[PDB]
Design a protein around this ligand. Structure first.
Ligand SMILES: *[C@@H]1O[C@H](CO)[C@@H](O[C@@H]2O[C@H](CO)[C@@H](O)[C@H](O)[C@H]2NC(C)=O)[C@H](O)[C@H]1NC(C)=O
Ligand SMILES: *[C@@H]1O[C@H](CO)[C@@H](O[C@H]2O[C@H](CO)[C@@H](O)[C@H](O)[C@H]2NC(C)=O)[C@H](O)[C@H]1NC(C)=O
Ligand SMILES: *[C@@H]1O[C@H](CO)[C@@H](O)[C@H](O)[C@H]1NC(C)=O
Ligand SMILES: *[C@@H]1O[C@H](CO)[C@@H](O)[C@H](O)[C@H]1NC(C)=O
Lengths: 452, 450
């Protein structure tokens, strides 16, 4: 391990961690430097799996996964205090949170050119993962698992395909939460999700079925039909521009609008990460004129208050503690420019998953919180079914014993050989944030190869 | 008002109420005495509307609505303490909670014959309302509103049709929460609900679509295809017999996932209202009773201990003016639900009758995560009445202290009838979203846009 990267006295903690945790940079392609924050297992880190965690966006920080989802401690509303987390994934694994690609968070590159794409990001993360192993040679033999969320549903399988070609890396499996596996299956399932979760009504639903469907087949993905598009445009407005929380239908929207943007003092805050209805000829805000206007612009995840986390990370002492070059600009959970200039290239993760499944060496899990609308569970359940694999287990519910309010159904699980699809009932996009104990129980049975 | 009925000092409250409240019996057809518990409006009861509240079952107590939903105070887990409810419906109305029919809660009949049906129940309630007005003549000119939930989706509109005919009663409107307005519409929308909420899977969904549907319609109600029926029986099992809470999909089931036994008491939780057109299936048939064991019926995945423990307190009974000879209070009466005869299959005629006068304000409101009387079944039901659209479907709002203004659900308005959803609430809307429910109720009473 690089002694110079270790975190000695992390602010906001009243009692110091009982496990070692590091913060530094992993070098990647070109002039890239990816900020990592590694937290060792709280029990037997020496023999605990190395678990990579990636958040999505594209252009959003994995320190979101640490500080707000499943890190050993979570930032508090004061943006000053950190409280230990009883459901930390690092209780049983050495977790590496990587801010990728360059420009996201405290990550950067010498030329500061942040326009990128799917292929380059997977190679950058791959090269960074190589660097990690040269900085932590002691973990070269530890079972490695690649995990992530949302857009990492793209990041993870593309990175996994590179890793499988490296015999030095002990790739054992991968898990993706509410991941964007297929834009088509996601966009289509969402329109259905919306009607049946009561957002549309029969009139809208009726026109949609009339203008976008023929047979029991609906095309809510790349339909050009005039009135169909006029209807999908409203569906788009209702789902994400009306004040509803696209990450959790049943939760309030932090700083709720009735629009496609909002102002925060004098900063335009954009919250559309560009992954939904991309193929529809919809009318959208001119995100492209935003940089020319000269107004301050920031991208925040939808219905998410980034204050606590941003307030914590931007504290000089925290930056000092985390070994952050003073020259680096302020931390934001998502980088607007990175997202805006990002180039999506793959249409779906089918080939990657097929390639990983062919080896029959990897443990794969796709898990979705069932009240999320950004990457709804249906689109991902369809995805997994379309892989046409051998079924190992007929759909069934999975349980979690809660602080003795007895075992309760935590969701449903479909198992095939080497791949399982699973739902977390009552959870939104950020499953660990909504259902901490169940997310952990699911994480634990995955690592341990125990049935869910 | 019946002075002798006044609740003078109710046990459990650390501070006495600011409003007068009464507990007694309303006489109805035959040997029947229905226990009522009237709580006056906390503000200007003299001019406040009289609001009847009925729960369902059939065979369950309206005190459930009081003590656990929107009463002025609610029972705490200790089944001893009552805490005031800042979202109480009695903040703006003189609410009348009535235990019905006979045999439910503290209600009874001199002959103890509790087998009944829809027609007898509405007549019974009607005569009870007549008696309430005999006891509280001062409340005769006050606007009357009939509200209820669940099976009261049948109780309420059928009672309103009787009430509509009595000019001495000042009926102004009715409101039904997660009401069973139509067995067919409830069953068909529930299967869709099940799939789109992630309980089914496409392998089961395909089988359903293949055997129960024909030409972009499905019949998940009274379908005669044998494999379709085999699939529907599976859907019924997952929804109401797998560990999921049918009243709120995203909520745990009280007691967890395994027939609660309570030592000489088999607890059954099958009220009998979903998939009624599938082959006969009664959960109690599975009960193996010892000679001397009693069967108690409770709402599915609910714990009735706090309310029952409180209500069976000898002191509580006394302050509530309950005849000492009456049996123990239970939130539901198994025998009443067991002998109950459902006569109406749909409430279309009743609502059309009430809508024809264009004199009553009608509201059907559903919590969208409930699977017993899901919001879609009732949205469909209200759409099927084919009334004039006043308000095109839109979200309605609630200003939260912590959250600021948030979308509380969606509302679609027609002339004299509005359908409204409560986002994130289950079957028992006020229990789930107290502030939204009170907000809705207040806009309803005051004829204000939702
Ligand atoms: C529903 O309940 C009412 C009341 O018991 C039933 O009507 C009674 O039927 C009995 C037997 O036919 C008669 O002796 C009574 O005179 C009737 N009472 C009244 C007020 O009409 C009714 O038949 C029951 N069942 C149905 C299907 O309606
Ligand atoms: C993905 O992004 C990378 C970098 O932004 C692109 O890389 C290529 O860029 C130029 C055009 O080929 C060349 O001058 C670079 O040498 C080349 N770099 C590499 C590593 O190939 C790449 O073309 C992008 N891919 C797509 C499909 O747009
Ligand atoms: C966001 O977080 C900060 C600190 O946690 C808090 O002060 C603020 O009120 C929160 N909500 C909004 C809308 O800013
Ligand atoms: C039911 O509630 C009571 C009191 O509220 C509690 O003591 C009891 O343990 C609960 N039982 C179950 C099965 O939830």
């Amino acid at each position: 391990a690089p002694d110079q990267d270790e975190i000695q006295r992390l602010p906001g903690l009243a009692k110091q961690p009982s496990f070692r945790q590091y913060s530094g940079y992993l070098k990647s392609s070109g002039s890239k430097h990816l900020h990592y924050w590694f937290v060792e297992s709280q029990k037997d880190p020496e023999n605990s799996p190395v678990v990579l965690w990636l958040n999505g966006g594209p252009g959003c920080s994995s320190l979101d996964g640490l500080l707000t989802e499943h890190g050993p401690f979570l930032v508090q509303p004061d943006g000053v205090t950190l409280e230990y987390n009883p459901y930390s994934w690092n209780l049983i694994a050495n977790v590496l949170y990587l801010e990728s690609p360059a420009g996201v968070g405290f990550s950067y590159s010498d030329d500061k050119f942040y326009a990128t794409n799917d292929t380059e990001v997977a190679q950058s993360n791959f090269e960074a993962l190589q660097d990690f192993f040269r900085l932590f040679p002691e973990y070269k033999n530890n079972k490695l698992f690649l995990t992530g969320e949302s857009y990492a549903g793209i990041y993870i399988p593309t990175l996994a395909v590179l890793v499988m070609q490296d015999p030095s890396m002990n790739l054992q499996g991968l898990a993706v939460g509410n991941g964007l596996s297929s834009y088509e299956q996601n966009d289509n399932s969402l329109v259905y999700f919306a009607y049946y979760h009561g957002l549309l009504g029969n009139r809208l639903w009726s026109s949609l079925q009339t203008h976008c469907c023929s047979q029991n087949k609906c095309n809510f993905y790349d339909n050009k039909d005039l009135e169909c598009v006029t209807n999908l445009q409203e569906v788009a407005r209702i789902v994400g521009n009306s004040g509803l929380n696209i990450y959790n239908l049943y939760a309030p929207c932090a700083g709720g609008v009735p629009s496609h943007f909002r102002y925060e003092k004098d900063t335009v805050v954009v919250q559309d990460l560009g992954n939904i209805f991309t193929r529809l000829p919809l009318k959208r805000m001119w995100h492209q004129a935003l940089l020319r206007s000269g107004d301050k612009v920031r991208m925040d995840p939808p219905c998410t208050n980034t204050t606590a986390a941003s307030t914590y990370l931007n504290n000089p002492y925290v930056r000092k503690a985390l070994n952050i070059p003073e020259q680096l600009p302020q931390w934001d959970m998502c980088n607007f420019l990175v997202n805006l200039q990002y180039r999506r290239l793959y249409r779906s993760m089918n080939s990657q998953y097929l390639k990983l499944l062919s080896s029959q060496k990897y443990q794969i899990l796709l898990y979705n919180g069932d009240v999320d609308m950004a990457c709804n569970f249906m689109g991902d359940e369809w995805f997994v079914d379309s892989l046409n694999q051998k079924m190992e287990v007929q759909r069934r519910p999975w349980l979690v014993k809660y602080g003795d309010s007895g075992e309760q159904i935590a969701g449903f699980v479909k198992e095939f050989s080497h791949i399982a699809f699973l739902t977390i009932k009552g959870a939104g996009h950020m499953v660990p944030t909504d259902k901490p104990l169940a997310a952990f129980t699911m994480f634990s049975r995955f690592l341990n190869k125990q049935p869910y």
